[PDB]
Structures are given as structure tokens and as C-alpha cells.
Design a protein around this ligand. Structure first.
Ligand SMILES: NC(=O)c1ccc[n+]([C@@H]2O[C@H](COP(=O)([O-])OP(=O)(O)OC[C@H]3O[C@@H](n4cnc5c(N)ncnc54)[C@H](O)[C@@H]3O)[C@@H](O)[C@H]2O)c1
Ligand SMILES: NC(=O)c1ccc[n+]([C@@H]2O[C@H](COP(=O)([O-])OP(=O)(O)OC[C@H]3O[C@@H](n4cnc5c(N)ncnc54)[C@H](O)[C@@H]3O)[C@@H](O)[C@H]2O)c1
Ligand SMILES: NC(=O)c1ccc[n+]([C@@H]2O[C@H](COP(=O)([O-])OP(=O)(O)OC[C@H]3O[C@@H](n4cnc5c(N)ncnc54)[C@H](O)[C@@H]3O)[C@@H](O)[C@H]2O)c1
Ligand SMILES: NC(=O)c1ccc[n+]([C@@H]2O[C@H](COP(=O)([O-])OP(=O)(O)OC[C@H]3O[C@@H](n4cnc5c(N)ncnc54)[C@H](O)[C@@H]3O)[C@@H](O)[C@H]2O)c1
Ligand SMILES: O=c1[nH]cnc2c1ncn2[C@@H]1O[C@H](COP(=O)(O)O)[C@@H](O)[C@H]1O
Ligand SMILES: O=c1[nH]cnc2c1ncn2[C@@H]1O[C@H](COP(=O)(O)O)[C@@H](O)[C@H]1O
Ligand SMILES: O=c1[nH]cnc2c1ncn2[C@@H]1O[C@H](COP(=O)(O)O)[C@@H](O)[C@H]1O
Ligand SMILES: O=c1[nH]cnc2c1ncn2[C@@H]1O[C@H](COP(=O)(O)O)[C@@H](O)[C@H]1O
Lengths: 375, 375, 375, 375
């Protein structure tokens, strides 16, 4: 019959909205708040959405959530909690090598939990690009680390490329994550060096002043899309880092091509985060600082020291983030994050820009007073 | 003579401004505050403007105003007042089925008043898409409801399409309104299911945080235009829902293709609205909350609970909205809302964008102090 | 009901094709063969199409056809035949003033026939812009001429403007046609001088070499549209002159805003045209030359002398042109030429460009041999 | 009064057509036949147009016409005739140095005639860029040459720049013309070398096959405009060379920014041109060949050898070219070539493109047979 012979199973489907390709080809510098994802078709419940994601070329997680390698975010307690919730944590390196190795050992000696072949909790750690980081690399490797991230603001350098090749020659079994990068040109040199994943973001962090101090960086949404589009051609996953304020930001970063999301301030002031609580203005809060702030390190500061208010425990906050990601996937019409990215690259997923008035209308407005309770 | 033979009765009419088609084809996400309607020609007084409008394919109202189905906006008293003023009200469903049926019966047992063939006040009600909403549908039908709205944030789903077909097979006399939708693709599935009208808006409500929590939605002006343009091809009217803050917003929604306008916060803190008044900061106010807030309903909140200040009675506020709609129609040069939409689709009505500086100049500015009294 | 209240009587009407405004705003130089008129809706027979048209501000004709003022096209016999068929003829001026006055007197003393208040056939004549043309103007005025055309290749000059004001001061009853012009800038000076119509075309004539000799002119379709759009603002009709090869060209010139069409070679080699027939190559033909050729007049030639083959009598050829114009109007969906121009300016009439391959496909192609017979 | 105070003496002047800047910024490669010049306003007779033009920074001619330095175009007889008519001729160099010096001396020993301070006829000559051209330069300088052209297909070279500096150091009184160039980048190096004029054109000659053989060159109209726009910034005049087939081409080259026009085939087969006449096909003709053809000079030919038909004497042909240039200036509305270029750069002069159908309509068409006589 003609109902099938004209075009097999493909209904008319009216054209409305922009594809990611034409949204990010306007040359404008877009942030997460500058656009939205148009709704699709629903034929499943939100509990049937799969959040399985690739951290690297051969490391798979149950959820796309990762903890940032900072001295006010990730130590053994945070790493254990993130591994148990189905994600992972990267331990910071501004301590001594012996201390970081002991923290990794505490994580390895401990339903959706991320584990290895030996049934131990997965753990990651950060290192620098100086010659003394090779002794630190050896201690982290003997402690049983599974994945390592080369931590830098600008990762397209001779020092990082030399470090990547040294690790690949000495430890062929270790997964190496390069970064930070914000352009396809920077991503090419690191993929050719032999990295297993990429870290994306420059100046987008809540405690980062790099864009005002050094005049270098890029808006986070366009950087994630551009780097992910290039890295997809070689099977290399992208970690979206910096600028996440709510679960809607996480859903946007994943829909633009990222495979996992790394967060700082969102996980700051939680029970498992390093440092103790203190009171001010009648409310509880905890310290949060940038690794490039003068406190954390002739010297030019690229970060600030501050505080965020109490958030509870990650064993109660991560399941809320999971439920929000699944509800966002159900609204757009995809049964998994893999399907979301597949329909994004095929042009089936649609987007729309927002003006300043559109953002004002989208947020809470025109009320005398209100309470904003998330869960 | 040549004054008529060159072009019959069509004067030169200088070309200035943009048509709705070219305003909403720029791909930008426009809100009501982002544009204006250019003035036309006046040959009648504002008292001669007709506001007759279609709620559905076969339900007509004297005015285009509707009350939102919320537990802080519409119960029997609000529905009676809106029906008497020439509009209609949709009773909320977060109560028990027996209670909602009794509230509809109060409205049915009570110059521009919206009435049926039996001369009783018109009344509407909302239902969900779960299998137990069928017993609620039966009680609402026996109570004498005239029109029913399937209440959901994203209405392009298997559950809503199944519910629409069940209602059409069982109650061929009942009018069914689908929604919420913001794209022509979503509107097509519901029009093919057999709906009688569409509800448009997603994340534009004053108490809505859906765009920030789930990253899904669309700016209200472009969504209303795009859905109305598609729904006009099948004789299906559009109800504009969310983001109405003043009578200028109502006039813009009607001029972009909507046939009726739904409002929750504009009618909140009125005498007929549910809940009692209370004092704070030396002024009177009433509670107003989103149906997706934690108070109104593992759980992800999509709304907030708050309060708005006193507004008086709708028997004095609705005639003010009517007078403002008529004055706006006289300024643009149309004798009825039907004529406004006809000249909008023909390209005769013209529009212009506003920059941020244009919005600042358009509002009250450069005064030490002032009093803004509407009526 | 909603079928009328959404938009009164205006059906959806799918958008396809370009309006004249957007076709002639591309900046490209378009000729009649570069575009087509898209078909419309038919609710009448071709015999019900009215071809009434304005020659000037107060002279109306039954058909839009006019004879060019050339010594191989228009004398008393051609003027009588065009007047009897419902059009008009302009007598050439390269003869002596006494001869042209006698030729006008023959026309004045001779169903759709174009006549004056005294029931005599309407007649027109051409003059130059030199001081001796004032004595010629007086003889033509005493002979009873009704309309006069100032014949020049470039009519935006001090000499033509002085002549127009002299005629208006001396003969307030005489109609004056200015030209030739191809731009709105040239048209403004002549409309402000006080002309009653405009003549449009420069270098588009079949016997014209002005574009190759003087590098000045414009493609005929864009020139007619641009001049007619400006002249419409003052109630001044436009005569389309030069480049007409078939009835499809006549229909295009009228649809682009012209009120009448002037033709040379199309009416050449007819029985009523001046000069006798002669044989060559076994077929009959008649001489046709440009007024700027060396034969018709230190000296720079802007025209050529040649010949075209026999065409029969105009009493048999004009009714064929009338039937073709009416069939073209029926195909596009208009009951009169006035309606055609009214729907062209309103944007309801639609157009499409043609590539070189499109013109090859549109003409007769892929045959070994054929006979092309018009009527 | 308001008629002067609103905008002093500046009338409305409707905007229609393109400026040269926006015509040549489309990126398309345009030839003289691809566009036209729109008509302006006439307040003078064609006999009042001044054709005075600058050949170099300090050599002025009565007419803008120059003879090309070819062995079938310019020798003493042609140079004397062009000097007497108000232009100049450049003697070819494919002969011996002694012969070229004797031809220059014949010209120097002989109303609008181009002369020097000593009242002798102006004369020019061509040379190459090899070391042997320095002895030739000395002989030409002693013979009394006034201006010299460095003859090459591509003049942006180290050999030509060295030759220009040698001539400026040795003969500060001699005028030096560089070329050929078609881009502003090439023009900059020669203007910085110290040239007094530029020669523009590459592959546009009637006998030139450089574009098909070497794949290098540029369309002549865009090359003349682009080189003239840049050379105007330093007071350096441009000579337009190649592609001139009629007086309309001459008017276009002058209106696009050139100060003088150099022609080959247009002056070929004239009485004063070198070589004797011969008969073929029943008509008289003379040989014309490119300097890069195998006959005129391991070897790659860039020119062809052929013949063109008889043209009469230049003493009757140059006055025809002068009359045509003056008529073209009167049609566009300028009293001199200086005014034409001034209104071209100010945006007051307007242009329009031509499609292939527009060129077909602009030329002679739809005739059985005709004769095209120019004067
Ligand atoms: N946008 C961001 O992500 C961002 C920006 C700024 C800072 N930071 C944070 O601040 C910390 C510091 O960042 P960073 O980029 O300065 O780290 P880094 O180690 O790259 O900085 C040290 C500097 O020394 C140079 N250097 C590196 N290796 C070297 C070697 N082997 N020999 C000689 N010179 C060498 C580098 O050019 C670098 O600028 C990081 O831990 C990072 O988390 C982040
Ligand atoms: N933009 C908006 O208009 C908006 C957005 C969010 C919330 N709200 C308000 O909040 C309230 C809740 O909105 P909602 O969209 O969550 O309502 P809903 O009933 O659609 O939500 C329940 C969820 O369960 C699923 N579901 C629905 N029917 C089902 C069935 N038969 N079987 C299995 N699963 C089913 C749906 O996917 C839906 O997300 C509404 O009353 C609405 O007024 C409005
Ligand atoms: N595209 C065309 O329509 C076109 C082009 C060229 C020629 N022609 C035909 O050739 C004929 C000649 O055309 P034309 O434009 O040369 O006519 P014309 O009378 O304008 O030409 C005479 C020239 O003398 C000048 N002149 C005019 N009046 C003058 C006065 N009072 N004092 C001093 N100088 C004056 C004008 O500048 C004009 O160029 C026309 O009859 C026309 O039909 C037509
Ligand atoms: N578009 C044009 O105008 C064009 C194109 C091709 C040929 N022509 C004609 O053909 C003739 C030959 O043109 P041409 O450009 O080949 O002349 P030319 O003298 O530049 O050619 C000789 C070649 O030798 C090289 N050369 C030049 N001077 C040199 C030096 N001192 N030492 C070493 N090498 C040197 C150059 O690269 C050049 O390609 C010209 O007279 C010209 O009129 C014209
Ligand atoms: O000092 C700093 N300046 C700028 N960026 C930093 C600095 N320290 C850490 N970062 C980045 O900030 C991210 C955390 O950003 P957040 O989630 O917005 O709070 C980290 O993962 C790093 O990429
Ligand atoms: O909890 C919620 N979140 C988001 N939108 C909601 C929620 N509850 C109701 N809505 C919408 O908000 C509209 C009222 O918008 P308002 O008049 O601008 O305040 C209602 O008609 C619903 O479409
Ligand atoms: O010598 C001439 N050169 C250029 N155009 C001319 C000349 N003589 C007449 N014309 C124009 O040619 C038109 C006729 O063009 P045709 O209908 O294509 O044959 C006349 O009405 C004049 O506008
Ligand atoms: O052999 C050749 N090939 C290409 N161009 C040449 C050659 N010889 C001369 N030319 C150019 O041709 C111009 C003359 O072109 P014409 O006026 O179209 O015939 C000369 O002034 C040179 O710039």
C-alpha cells in the first residue's frame, strides 16, 4: 500500500527547532543557560532510562557522575561514596606522594557500584607534568590506581605530551586522561599522543578567574560540543568539567556529546568532602577554593578561596541527581544517554536559543516571596 | 480612471516593520517582552471591538480568558465567577474524584455569561493519564462537565494518546483538550489522536522551575506562534498557558495565533481564589504554589510554593482586562480578535524586536519616585 | 464555531514561491525569460477576463496594446487598426510637421474601439525636445491629437522637463507621456514636472544596440517593476516598451506593474505597417529599422536596419494576443488585469526563477523535427 | 524655511541600483558584458564633455586612448596618428634596439595633439627586464622617449623591481609604467618600487590563451576596479589593457576607475598599423598576433596568430570612439571622466548585473536579417 511504499515507516514529523550542528555553527559563545532542548515523544517510564557511560576507552560506569580532583572536594571518603553510588572520584595531588598513595589504598581496601576485575572499588588520581611526578606516578601505580588524569589549565603542551608517552611506554595497562582542552586543535595533539579520554573546560569553574586574569578560555557549552564532535571520530570519550550548577546543566552537557560530567562546587559542603563545617550568618557552610588561588599554592592567582553552604550527604544527593537526569531523558524522548547522543548527532534531537528576557521568564518570577525546595 | 485601474482600491501603504512569519523565522527564542506590535489605522471606538473566541472546535466564549487548573486558583467559586464574566474555569484534580465532581455540580446548579443549551454555566475540569483517572472521568461526566483537559508537563506520550482515544470511544459528546505541547511535532500526534484544542507552554509559568531542573521547554511567544500556525491547518484552537503578567502579554498571545489565554498568577490572591488571606510586611497576600512543588505532591520538584499580594475581586478585575484588550485592538486597527489573527497571517499586521535598552526605555524610567496605578 | 473564529475566511494556503518584491530585491538583472508566474485557483472561464486599462491618468482603453512610434510601424492605417481593435497608436515624427498632422487628421476623421467624447477614434503622436518641436506641437494640437509622447532614449533631462512645463502651461487639456526611463530616480523628476504617464525601457528593443554602444540601460523586467512600483504612489500608469517577442512576455510585463504594453517588431511586417513587402530566400518579409540607425537619421548609431517576415493583418493578430492574455490571466487566477496587479502588490501572486537548463526544458526540445503554429 | 533647513539642497533621490563597491564585493568574477551603468540626469550637450586624462603622475592627454606595444599594432606611423588625435602609442620591442630608437626618433621629429614642452609629439616605448634591456633603455632615452613601459605578463617580480629602481636612479626625469598586474597585492610592490602608472590585465586579450595554458589571471572588470581602488590611494593612474571590443567597453573601463585604455585588436587592421593587407573569403584583412605566440618569439605559447578585417584609417575611427565616449558620459550624467570616477567612488553612480537572458535581450535579436553600421 502507499502508506508504507512512499517512505517506509518514516512519518512526516514537522520540522521545528535547530540541530546541535546549526546551533553551534553561528560563531556565538554559548553557555548552558543560553539554550534549551525541545521535548520529543514518550513511550516509557523514567525508571527504564539507562545511565551507563564510558569514563575512558575501556572503563565503564553505572552513572555519568565524577568528583573533581581538588583539596576541598576529593579524598578517600568522597571517592568511596562516589564509587558506591556508581560513579568515581579523582584524588587531588597538592599533598605529598606518600599521602595520595595511602588515600588510593584506603579506597581499594574497602547495586550500581563501580568495581574492577578483582571486585575492588574503582579509584582515580591526578598528577602534574614535572619530572618529580614520575615518582608520584610509581607510588599511585603500586597503590592500585585504575585511571590517572594529567591536571593542568592548558593541556596542549610539550610537557604533557612527553608525560603521556612515558606513561604508555612504562604502564601499558594504565588509563591516562589528558586536559584541560577547549578546541579540536588541542584535542588532536593529545589523541595522537595516545590518551584514553579528554577533560574539557577552561575558565568555566565557579572559583576560576582565568578568563579575567589571562584572557584565555571558552564558553563551556560550545567547547564541550566542539571537542566531543572531534573526539567521537577516534572513539575517545569527553569528561565535561566546570560550570555545573544544577541537574539541568548535567543533562545539557551529556546531550551536547560529553560521556561523563565532573563537578566541584556542586559536591562541595557535603558530609564526605574534606574539611570541617563552620557557622556564619546563622547558617552552616564549608570552605571551597580554587587550586590556582594563592592559598592552595612571581605568583599569579587564577582561582579564589571561599565557602558554600551545607548540602547533606552524597548518599542522599547523588540519587536525586540520578532521578533528575532520568526525568530529563524521558522529557526529550530517549531510553539511554547513548540514545540521546546518537539522536543528537543524527539531527533528530532539537534545540532552541534563549534571549535575556527568555531566561528571566524561564526562572521563578513575579512572586512576593517563595521557597525553592529541590527534593 | 487610472486611480482605480492601476491596482483596485489598494493604496501604496509604505512597507515598514516585520511580519510574524519573518520575526519567528530568525531561530532566536523570543518571549513576550522581546517584541512589540506596530500601530495601524483607526476607524472605530474601543467599545465596538468583539472578543468572541473559540475554546474548542464547538465551544465559544464571549471573552478569551480562562482560569488555570491549580489548587490555589480554580474551585467552584472561581469557576462561577469566570463563567459569569464570559470566560471559563478548569477545576484542579489533586483532590479526590468525589470532591472534584461535587465542585463541578456546584457550578452547573448556579450579559456575557458562558452557558450551555440547558442554560447552565459552562464548566471544565482536569484529569491525569493513569488508569484510575477513568473512574474520575466517569464521575466528572455524570456531574455534567462540558470540557476536559489532560493535565501534564509533556503531553506527547503513549499514555495521553491512549486516554484521548478511550474518551472519544466512550464519550463522543465530550470535548477533550490535550497538552502541554510547545512544538508542531508534538501537536501533530495529539491532533491525529482526535483532540478538540491544545494547551501550549512548558517552563514559562511564574512558579515553574522545569527549564532549570529538566533542561526542557521553549520561550512562550515562539512556542505559541509555532503551535498555533500548525494547529490552524486543522481548525484546532490553541490555549496560551503560562507567563502572563499584564494585559499587554494577553494581547500579544492572542495576536500570535492563540484563541484563548490561561493564567494562574494573574488571578491568584483574588477573593474567589482558594485559600484564606494572611498578613506579612504590613500588606495582605495569599499562597500560590506550583502543582509540581513538593508541597502540592524519588520525588523531583518542578515547581515552587510562594505567595502574591491581594488583587481584589475578579468581578472588578476581569472588566479591566477586557477594556485593556479592546484598547490594544483599537491601537493596532482591528474590530475583533478574529480580524487580528486574520491580518497577522496575511502579513498586514507588523512587529518589531526590542533590545535590552529598548525594554529599559519602554518601561517607567528616570524618576525619583512614582505610583503605578492600573485602574 | 472555531472554523471561522480562528481566522475569518482565511484558509491555511501553503507558502511556496517568491513574491515580486523578494524576486526583484536580489539585485540580479532579470529579463522576461528569467522567471515564471506560479498558477493559482480557477473559478471562471477565460471569456470573463476584463482587459480594461489606463493609458494615462484620464485615458482608458479596452485592451492594453499600443503601437510604437516608428517609421516602419505606425502611420494612419496602423493607428486606425489599433484604435478599432481597442488599443491606440502613436504616429512617428521623423517626417515633416505638416505630414504628421495630416496623418493624425486621417485617424480623427475615420465593439471595443477606443474613442473620445466626440465619438472619434483616439490618436497619439510623438515629438522631440528641440525648440522647433513647439511648432510641431501646435500643428498636432490643431489636428485634434489626444495624447503626446516625448520621444527620447534618456528622458531625465533639462530639455524634456522644460518641454513638459511648456505643454502644461499652453495646453492644460493635452495628455503628456514622458520617457524613456528605467529607474525610480529618473521617474521622480518627470512625475514632479507634471507628466500623465511614463515610458519604460532602455536598450531592450529588438533593433537597439544602445547597451553595447553606450554601456547604459537596464534589463526590462526589473526596470518595469522598479519604475511601476514608484509611479503607483502618485497614480501614474507605466507603458512597458521594448523586448516583447510573444504573448507570454505581454502577460509578464502587465503582471509586474505595467498598465499598457508598447511593441515594435511584434507588429512589424503586418499589412497595416508602413512600407511594401519584398521576397528573399523564398519567403515574404518587410523592412524594420531602429530610429537611431544611420538610415533613419559626428553621428553615432544606436539602432540597426533589417527585416522581419510576414505576419498577416492586425485585425486577425490582435484578437489572438487578446485570447492569449485572457488565458494567461485564467491560469494565474485573476478576473482582470487590475486584479492581477492588486494581488501582485499584496504578495498573493507568486513567482519562480529559471536557470539556463530550466529555459531549455521549458521550450520545445528532444524532437527530430516539428511545426510551431500559434493560431 | 523647511524645504532647505531639513537637508540643505539634497533632494530625496530614490535609492535604486548597486554602487561599484557592492557590485565588486560579491566575490564573483565579472567581465564588461556582465553589468551595465544606470542612467542619471542630463543638463548639458554631449559636445561639452571633457575627456582630459592622466597617462602617468605628470603626463596628461586630451583623450584616454592608447595603442598597445605589439608588432602588428604600434610603430612610428601608428604612434604619430595616436599622438595627433590626442592619445599616445607605445612602440613594441621585439625588433633590435637600434630599430626601436629610430622609430621613436621618427615620432619626435614630426587641435588636441599630445605634445611636450619642446612642442614635439609625445612618444612611449616598451622594454623587457633582462640585463640587455639597459642598453636598449639608453638608446630609447637618447632618442627622446617621454615614457617607458616594462612589458611582461606578470609584473610582480624581483627582475621588474630591480629594473624600476635602476631606471629611477639613472633617469629621474623618465616616467616608468609597471605591469601587468590584476591584484592590489601585486600593485603595492610596484608602487613601493616607485612606478608612475600601472598596466592592468592578464589573459583578457583577444589573442591571449594564458588563462587556459597557465591557469592564472583574472576577469578584466573586477581586476581594473580592484587595482584602481588601491592605486588611487597613492595618486597612481591605471591603464586598462585587454578585452576592449567596442566603445561601451571603453566607457565601462573608465567608469570603474581606469584613467586610460590600451587596445590591440580594436586598432588592428587600420591603415597606420604595421604589415600589408591581403584578401581571403572575398573581404580584406590584416594579420594580428600575440607577442607570446610561437611566431612572435622549451617554448610554451601563451598567444595565437590570426587576422582581423579592414577598419579604415584611425584619423576617422578615433573621432568615432571620442563621440561614443562623450555620448556615454552624457547618458550617465557627468561633464567629464574625472567627474565620472568621482561620482563612482562617492556611490552616486549606479550599476546593475546582467543574466545570460539579459545579454541576449540587450544585443540585436528576433530579426530575419539586418545590417549593423556603427558610423
Ligand atoms: N580552567 C582550568 O581548568 C584551570 C585554570 C587554571 C588553574 N586551574 C587549576 O590550578 C592548578 C594549576 O594549573 P596549571 O595549568 O598552572 O598547572 P601547571 O602545572 O600546568 O602549571 C605550571 C606551569 O609551569 C609550566 N610547566 C609545566 N610542566 C613543566 C615542566 N616539566 N618543565 C617546565 N615548565 C613546566 C606550564 O607551562 C604551567 O603553566 C591545576 O591543578 C588546575 O586544577 C585550572
Ligand atoms: N510546563 C508545565 O506546564 C508543567 C511542567 C511541570 C509540571 N507541571 C504541573 O505539575 C503537575 C505534574 O506534571 P507531570 O507532567 O509530571 O504530570 P504526569 O502525570 O505526566 O507525571 C507523572 C509521570 O509519570 C508518567 N506517566 C504518566 N501516565 C502514566 C501511566 N499511565 N503509566 C505509567 N507512567 C505514566 C509520565 O511520564 C509522567 O512524567 C501537572 O499537574 C502540571 O500542571 C506543569
Ligand atoms: N532605449 C531607447 O528607447 C532608445 C535608445 C536610443 C535611441 N532610441 C530611438 O532613437 C531616437 C533618438 O533618440 P535620442 O534619445 O537620441 O533622442 P534625442 O532627441 O534625445 O537625441 C538628441 C540629443 O541631443 C540632446 N538634446 C535634446 N534636446 C536638446 C535641446 N533642446 N538642446 C540641445 N540639445 C538637446 C540630447 O541630449 C540627445 O542626446 C528616438 O526617436 C528613439 O526612439 C531609443
Ligand atoms: N596577460 C598578458 O598581458 C600577457 C600574458 C602572456 C604574454 N604576454 C605577452 O607576451 C610577451 C611575453 O610575456 P612574458 O611575461 O613572458 O615576458 P617576460 O620577459 O616576463 O618572460 C620571460 C620569463 O623569464 C623570466 N625572467 C624575466 N626577467 C628575467 C631576468 N632578468 N633573469 C632571469 N629570468 C627572467 C620571467 O619569469 C618570465 O616569465 C610580452 O611582451 C607580453 O606582451 C602578455
Ligand atoms: O584555581 C582555579 N582556577 C580556575 N579553574 C580551576 C581552578 N581550580 C580548579 N579549577 C577547575 O574548576 C573545576 C570545578 O568547577 P565547579 O564545578 O564549577 O565548581 C575543576 O574541576 C577544575 O577544572
Ligand atoms: O509545578 C509547576 N511547574 C511548572 N509549571 C507549572 C507547575 N504547576 C503549574 N504549572 C503551569 O503554570 C501555569 C500558570 O502560569 P502563571 O500564570 O504564569 O503563573 C499553569 O497553567 C501550568 O501550565
Ligand atoms: O534605434 C534604436 N535603438 C534602440 N532602441 C530603439 C531604437 N529605435 C526605437 N527603439 C526602441 O525600440 C522599441 C521597439 O522594440 P521592439 O518591440 O522589441 O521591436 C521602441 O518602442 C523604442 O523604445
Ligand atoms: O601572446 C599574448 N598572450 C596574452 N596576452 C597578450 C599577448 N600579447 C599581448 N597580450 C596582451 O593583449 C593586449 C591586447 O588585447 P586586445 O586589445 O584584446 O586585442 C596587449 O596590450 C597585451 O596586454
Amino acid at each position: 500500500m502507499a502508506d508504507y511504499l512512499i517512505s517506509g515507516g518514516t512519518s512526516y514529523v514537522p520540522d521545528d527547532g535547530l540541530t546541535a550542528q546549526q546551533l553551534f555553527n553561528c560563531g556565538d559563545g554559548l553557555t548552558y543557560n543560553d539554550f534549551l532542548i525541545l521535548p520529543g515523544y514518550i513511550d516509557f517510564t523514567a525508571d527504564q532510562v539507562d545511565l551507563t557511560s564510558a569514563l575512558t576507552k575501556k572503563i565503564t560506569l553505572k552513572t555519568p557522575l565524577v568528583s573533581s580532583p581538588m583539596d576541598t572536594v576529593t579524598e578517600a571518603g568522597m571517592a568511596i561514596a562516589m564509587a558506591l553510588t556508581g560513579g568515581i572520584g579523582f584524588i587531588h595531588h597538592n599533598c605529598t606522594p606518600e599521602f595520595q598513595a595511602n588515600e588510593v589504598r584506603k579506597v581499594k581496601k574497602y547495586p550500581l557500584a563501580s568495581k574492577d576485575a578483582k571486585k575492588q572499588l574503582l579509584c582515580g588520581a591526578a598528577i602534574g607534568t614535572h619530572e618529580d611526578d614520575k615518582y608520584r606516578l610509581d607510588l599511585l601505580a603500586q597503590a592500585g590506581v585504575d585511571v590517572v588524569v594529567l591536571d593542568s589549565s592548558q593541556g596542549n603542551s610539550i610537557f604533557q605530551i612527553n608525560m603521556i608517552k612515558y606513561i604508555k611506554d612504562k604502564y601499558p595497562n594504565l588509563q591516562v586522561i589528558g586536559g584541560n582542552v577547549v578546541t579540536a586543535a588541542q584535542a588532536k595533539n593529545l589523541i595522537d599522543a595516545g590518551v584514553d579520554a579528554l577533560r574539557v573546560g577552561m575558565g568555566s569553574g565557579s572559583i576560576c578567574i582565568t578568563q579575567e586574569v589571562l584572557a584565555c578560555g571558552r564558553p563551556q557549552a560550545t567547547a564541550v560540543y566542539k571537542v566531543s564532535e572531534y573526539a567521537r571520530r577516534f572513539g575517545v570519550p569527553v569528561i565535561a568539567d566546570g560550570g555545573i550548577q544544577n541537574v539541568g546543566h548535567i543533562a545539557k552537557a551529556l546531550a551536547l556529546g560529553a560521556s561523563t560530567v565532573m563537578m566541584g562546587s556542586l559536591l562541595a559542603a557535603t558530609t564526605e568532602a574534606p574539611g570541617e563545617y563552620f557557622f556564619s550568618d546563622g547558617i552552616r557552610l564549608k570552605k571551597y577554593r580554587g587550586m590556582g588561588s594563592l592559598d592552595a599554592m612571581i605568583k599569579v592567582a587564577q582561582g579564589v578561596s571561599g565557602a558554600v553552604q551545607d548540602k547533606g550527604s552524597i548518599h542522599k544527593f547523588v540519587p536525586y541527581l540520578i532521578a533528575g537526569i532520568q526525568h530529563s531523558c524521558q522529557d526529550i524522548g530517549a531510553k539511554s544517554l547513548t540514545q540521546v547522543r546518537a539522536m543528537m548527532y543524527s539531527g533528530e534531537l532539537k534545540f532552541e536559543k534563549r534571549t535575556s528576557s527568555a531566561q528571566v521568564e524561564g526562572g521563578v518570577h513575579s512572586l512576593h516571596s517563595y521557597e525553592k525546595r529541590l527534593f
